[PDB]
């Protein structure tokens, strides 16, 4: 693989270098302009040989890092834990505030910093590359795969994607709101005491590490659980639905619509069953087109739903890749980055549908739907699909944003968390510095790759479903709707699947939808179901958030410092240094008063005493948390009769007398005045 | 040379010896010197290293409490600190620029304790009272 | 017990590999001194309380049998 991956690049390298001798300013084709334009991107050979190797570096450094991560219980420092295994089930399925905020914090205090300084040296990198690629940043340099030209109508600019998106996304947060404040008001009854029903939701109890989803809080969310999920994994097994007939009924669901059959050596060359433990390969169902009309699935198939519908996406994928088989190599594959995917997971929300699996014998006939369980399929569907939209579209403004240099290198998490409070309505439990980077902690991140397309594959399908349901003739709610038997949709689905990238993407949208931009308005009318029930469940419930209440406001001591005054002149200057001999300060106060009130010897260090909005007048908040537990909360009672027992060596540290350095709730006193006889 | 002396050790060089003298400068109310108080020392030093290497050599070096070691404590309040490199033990900051790093800074160190230069001597850091002014 | 070079945390070491090895093959004083003290310093802080409790237990356990 190495070998034949090496010469595949060293060819493709050397015809870059050759594909520059015809310039774009005299090619009159499209098709060829644009395979030239395949072509001719430079990419990282752009950059001088020291600064590429940097690069390639950093790149492996980050990828290694974020895949052998470990994170340790302070209690046993001999077990720890990575991320795949062990982490993602502590934070998919512990019930535990405490455990799954040790495990968030540790995971973006243990990577985190780690990722800091080498993707500031990544960003650096990768614009320096893409400016010296004709590029204003690395980011336009991403946004340039939605670019079109030279069509006369058809044109699709770099700079209107940001648009498209913003726009459209201003017609979610109707929706989203409200299921925001339903989840809030369900996760409330299993973390008390921890969620106000004015603010955001803390970040770790969104059933996933970073929340990018939010499937796993489907059990604490569901609307209704007495009525059961519908579930033919069972009727399946009863039936003996081998790993061999689900492809056979997944092939005539896509003949049904007018689709070609599948290719003879398909079946012969397919892994779709687990080979044992004779033989080791991945499980990660895959589709691959070989060239030269030779399609394959990969796929460890056992008995269940899931890997049904999984397989109709990866048949949907194959489909999609056979159907462009005609056009020239560089032209075989979807219209942009979202395409492939959205064909894919439209074949496997048709086929998850009731009435398909009635129609096909795993459903019993004598089944009605109740609209209960409507509701619930609809909810546990937007957990998932309408969970990812504000996130997936704060990271890519973020990562713009930072490509852009719009914010300061000194300037990054006060801003990413400054975001996730407005936008997606997620706060962070405890306060992260500069030193933090949190959006490193994410895959696609850290490992360079772009993110806009989660969002955009998000819509398209959807516009894909409706205006397949519009020519089958569907009349009933879009969520219920079912494609098969519809020749129609299937030849207008396949008249943009051919097309591939021969043509611009917005043309291929025209050839579907029979519009030129993406649309949200087609996932709202899928939602909107759901939406309804969701006005009507929050009648009560204050719907939104505010962007000021955080789980650790409660127990925040206020300071406020007044150098210049109290100094004059001769006052030093308020930079981090000052800040790490406060925190000193303020932990050795805490020490003392455990040792001489309550006779414990608790070992508190600076990296206890965490500091949030910190301003310009130096004011800010701190609140110091256990030795090693970043759970506990040490009270706001006694950190105040702390502060008050040793206040005057913290007065003497800095040279302040009372009055310039205030804690805005512990008032001194002066001194009785003294009488005379 | 056959034998050995219990007195030499790979660290006795880069080796300031600090003495505090509490019950002569403060009289009464005097604190007693327990952990707490090697904790804000140590503290204290880690801060003047950090201000030494950001306002003189322009380097950003995130030292530590920890970085701070203290050896031969004794009743007297007398021991021996050096400091090592924030990751690196094997580096030592070398005496020369500890001890550039406490003048800087002595004052705060001073005020953190409420001693003045004659209760908190560093052996080898002599303070300077300040030029007397002549009138015209 | 395990170390990890602060450089890459991601890379540790056990005792009975790696760790012997550097002690018993390297010649950087830089290199030994990494892997001693932060030998004594990862397992010996572990070990403190545990051996005060063990200390106590066992001269109870001679005591009752007249030792
Ligand atoms: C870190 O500090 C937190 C406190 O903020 C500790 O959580 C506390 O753990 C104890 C021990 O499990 C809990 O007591 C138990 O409560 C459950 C709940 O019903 C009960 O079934 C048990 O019988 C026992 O009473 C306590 O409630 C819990 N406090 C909070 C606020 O969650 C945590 O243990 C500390 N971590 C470590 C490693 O010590
Ligand atoms: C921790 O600090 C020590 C210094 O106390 C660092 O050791 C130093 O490492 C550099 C880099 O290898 C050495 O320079 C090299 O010296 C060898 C010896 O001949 C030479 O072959 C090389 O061309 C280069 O000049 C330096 O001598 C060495 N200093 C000492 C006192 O050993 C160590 O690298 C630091 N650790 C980390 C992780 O940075
Ligand atoms: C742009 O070039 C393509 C590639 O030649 C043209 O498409 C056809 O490609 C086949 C196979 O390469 C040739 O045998 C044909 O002669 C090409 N032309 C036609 C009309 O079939 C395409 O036509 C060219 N487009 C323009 C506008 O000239
Ligand atoms: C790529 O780099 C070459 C020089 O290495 C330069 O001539 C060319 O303009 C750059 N861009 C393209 C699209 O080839
Ligand atoms: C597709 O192939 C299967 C057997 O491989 C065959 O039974 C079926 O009829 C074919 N499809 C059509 C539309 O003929
Ligand atoms: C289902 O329909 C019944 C009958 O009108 C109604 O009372 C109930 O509220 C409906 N529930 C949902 C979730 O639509
Ligand atoms: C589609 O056509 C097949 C073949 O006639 C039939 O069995 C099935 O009921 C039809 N409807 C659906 C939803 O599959
Ligand atoms: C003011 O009173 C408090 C106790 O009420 C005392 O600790 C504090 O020292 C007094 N301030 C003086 C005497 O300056
Ligand atoms: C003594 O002189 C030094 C420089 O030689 C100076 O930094 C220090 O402040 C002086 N002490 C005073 C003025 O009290
Ligand atoms: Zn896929």
Redesign the interface.
């Given at each position: 693989m190495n070998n034949a991956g090496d010469k595949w690049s060293a060819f493709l390298k050397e015809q870059s270098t050759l594909a520059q001798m015809y310039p774009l300013q005299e090619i009159q084709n499209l098709t060829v302009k644009l395979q030239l334009q395949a072509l001719q991107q430079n990419g990282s050979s752009v950059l001088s040989e020291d600064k590429s190797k940097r690069l390639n570096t950093i790149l492996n450094t980050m990828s290694?890092?974020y895949s052998?991560?470990?994170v340790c219980n302070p209690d046993n420092?001999?077990e720890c834990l990575l991320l795949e295994p062990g982490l993602n089930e502590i934070m998919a399925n512990s019930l535990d505030y405490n455990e799954r905020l040790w495990a968030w914090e540790s995971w973006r205090s243990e990577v985190g910093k780690?990722l800091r300084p080498l993707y500031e040296e990544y960003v650096v990198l990768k614009n320096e590359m893409a400016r010296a690629n004709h590029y204003e940043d690395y980011g336009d340099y991403w946004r340039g795969d939605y670019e079109v030209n030279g069509v006369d109508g058809y044109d699709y600019s770099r700079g209107q994607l940001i648009e498209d998106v913003e726009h459209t996304f201003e017609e979610i947060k109707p929706l989203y709101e409200h299921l925001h404040a339903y989840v809030r008001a369900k996760l409330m009854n299993a973390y008390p005491s921890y969620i106000s029903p004015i603010g955001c939701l803390p970040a770790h109890l969104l059933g996933d590490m970073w929340g990018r989803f939010w499937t796993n809080l489907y059990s604490l969310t569901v609307p209704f659980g007495q009525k059961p999920n519908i579930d033919v994994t069972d009727a399946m097994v009863d039936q003996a639905w081998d790993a061999q007939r689900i492809f056979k009924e997944a092939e005539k669901f896509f003949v049904s619509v007018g689709l070609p059959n599948m290719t003879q050596g398909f079946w012969e060359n397919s892994m779709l069953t687990d080979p044992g433990n004779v033989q080791k390969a991945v499980c990660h169902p895959t589709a691959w087109d070989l060239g030269k009309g030779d399609f394959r699935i990969l796929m460890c198939t056992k008995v269940t739903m899931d890997d049904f519908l999984t397989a109709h996406h990866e048949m949907g994928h194959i489909q999609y890749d056979m159907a462009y088989a005609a056009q020239p190599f560089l032209l075989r594959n979807g219209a942009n980055e979202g395409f492939h995917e959205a064909v894919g997971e439209i074949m496997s929300l048709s086929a998850a549908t009731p009435k398909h699996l009635k129609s096909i014998g795993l459903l019993s006939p004598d089944f009605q739907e109740d609209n209960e369980t409507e509701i619930n399929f609809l909810l546990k569907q937007a957990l998932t699909i309408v969970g990812t939209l504000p996130f997936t579209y704060m990271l890519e403004k973020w990562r713009w944003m930072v490509f852009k240099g719009e914010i300061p290198k000194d300037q990054w998490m006060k801003k990413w968390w400054e975001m996730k409070r407005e936008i997606v309505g997620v706060v962070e439990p405890v306060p992260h510095d500069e030193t933090y980077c949190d959006p490193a902690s994410l895959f696609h991140v850290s490992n360079d790759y772009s993110f806009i397309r989660y969002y955009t594959r998000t819509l398209y399908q959807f516009q894909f479903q409706e205006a397949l349901c519009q020519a089958a003739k569907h009349e009933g709610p879009l969520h219920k709707c079912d494609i098969s038997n519809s020749t129609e949709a299937g030849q207008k689905l396949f008249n943009m699947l051919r097309l591939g990238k021969s043509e611009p993407w917005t043309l291929a949208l025209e050839n579907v939808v029979g519009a030129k931009n993406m649309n949200v308005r087609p996932l709202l009318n899928y939602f909107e179901p759901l939406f309804t029930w969701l006005k009507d469940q929050n009648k009560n419930s204050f719907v939104g958030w505010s962007t000021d209440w955080s789980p650790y406001a409660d127990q925040s001591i206020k300071v406020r410092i007044s150098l210049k005054s109290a100094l004059g002149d001769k006052a030093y200057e308020w930079?981090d240094?000052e800040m790490?001999?406060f925190r000193?300060?303020v932990?050795?106060a805490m020490?003392?008063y455990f040792?001489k009130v309550k006779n414990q010897m608790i070992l508190f260090?600076?990296e206890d005493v965490r500091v949030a909005n910190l301003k310009p007048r130096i004011s800010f908040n701190f609140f110091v948390t256990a030795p090693k537990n970043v759970s506990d909360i040490i009270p706001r009672t006694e950190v105040e009769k702390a502060i008050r027992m040793s206040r005057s060596?913290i007065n003497?540290?800095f040279?302040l007398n009372d009055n310039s350095l205030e804690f805005l709730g512990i008032q001194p006193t002066l001194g009785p005045p003294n009488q005379p006889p």
């Open positions: 290694t890092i052998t991560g470990k420092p001999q780690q930079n240094n790490y001999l000193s300060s932990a050795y020490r003392q040792l260090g600076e060596r003497d540290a040279r």
